[PDB]
Amino acid sequence: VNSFSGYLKLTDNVYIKNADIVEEAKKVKPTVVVNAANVYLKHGGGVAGALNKATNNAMQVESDDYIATNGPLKVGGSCVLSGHNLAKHCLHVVGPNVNKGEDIQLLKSAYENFNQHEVLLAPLLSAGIFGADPIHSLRVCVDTVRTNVYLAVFDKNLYDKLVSSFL
Ligand SMILES: CC(C)n1nnnc1SCc1c(C(=O)O)sc2cccc(F)c12
């Protein structure tokens, strides 16, 4: 039993809710919140901008030190950093950005990072301003992630579309 409330069950291990991931994280304080990051950990917009704003820019400060030490992530890769006021940890995961011309085939590799954590609160990778087909991303999620994932979908019309089209 965990404290995630109001989620629709898609599969044995994947759940979904129309919710602001910042507000869900503040309420639940999950062990892991997933950020939809880029390789430079520049948290400008979308999920990343929203999470970073909620941390008062502390996520960005920490991220800049990470990059200065380690260099950029790979598309499809991840790193674990602090969750600040939102979660114990933030798993920064880089899905492909179609609006940068990046290979959507890397989406499965991106979701594989979730399997290193027993329970996660996450957005749909590569959706929104990353430009991928969200129905496809949800399919890749359910077919790749084996650990317990709680998906928070910000856009109400998107949530409705995803539920109504899910196989
Ligand atoms: C958190 C919330 C307040 N917020 N604010 N600004 N953007 C958002 S989330 C829009 C969105 C998704 C969704 O609608 O769930 S998944 C997804 C994946 C990558 C980038 C995204 F932008 C995005």
From Swiss-Prot:
Catalytic function, reaction form: Thiol-dependent hydrolysis of ester, thioester, amide, peptide and isopeptide bonds formed by the C-terminal Gly of ubiquitin (a 76-residue protein attached to proteins as an intracellular targeting signal)
Domain Macro: 1-167
Superkingdom, taxonomy of origin: Viruses
Compartments reported by the entry: Host endoplasmic reticulum membrane
Function: Responsible for the cleavages located at the N-terminus of the replicase polyprotein. Participates together with nsp4 in the assembly of virally-induced cytoplasmic double-membrane vesicles necessary for viral replication. Antagonizes innate immune induction of type I interferon by blocking the phosphorylation, dimerization and subsequent nuclear translocation of host IRF3. Also prevents host NF-kappa-B signaling. In addition, PL-PRO possesses a deubiquitinating/deISGylating activity and processes both 'Lys-48'- and 'Lys-63'-linked polyubiquitin chains from cellular substrates.
Subunit structure: May form homohexamers. Interacts with N protein.
Name this protein carries in UniProt: Papain-like protease nsp3
Organism: Severe acute respiratory syndrome coronavirus 2 (2019-nCoV)
Gene name of the record: rep
Range within the parent protein: 1025 to 1191 of 7096
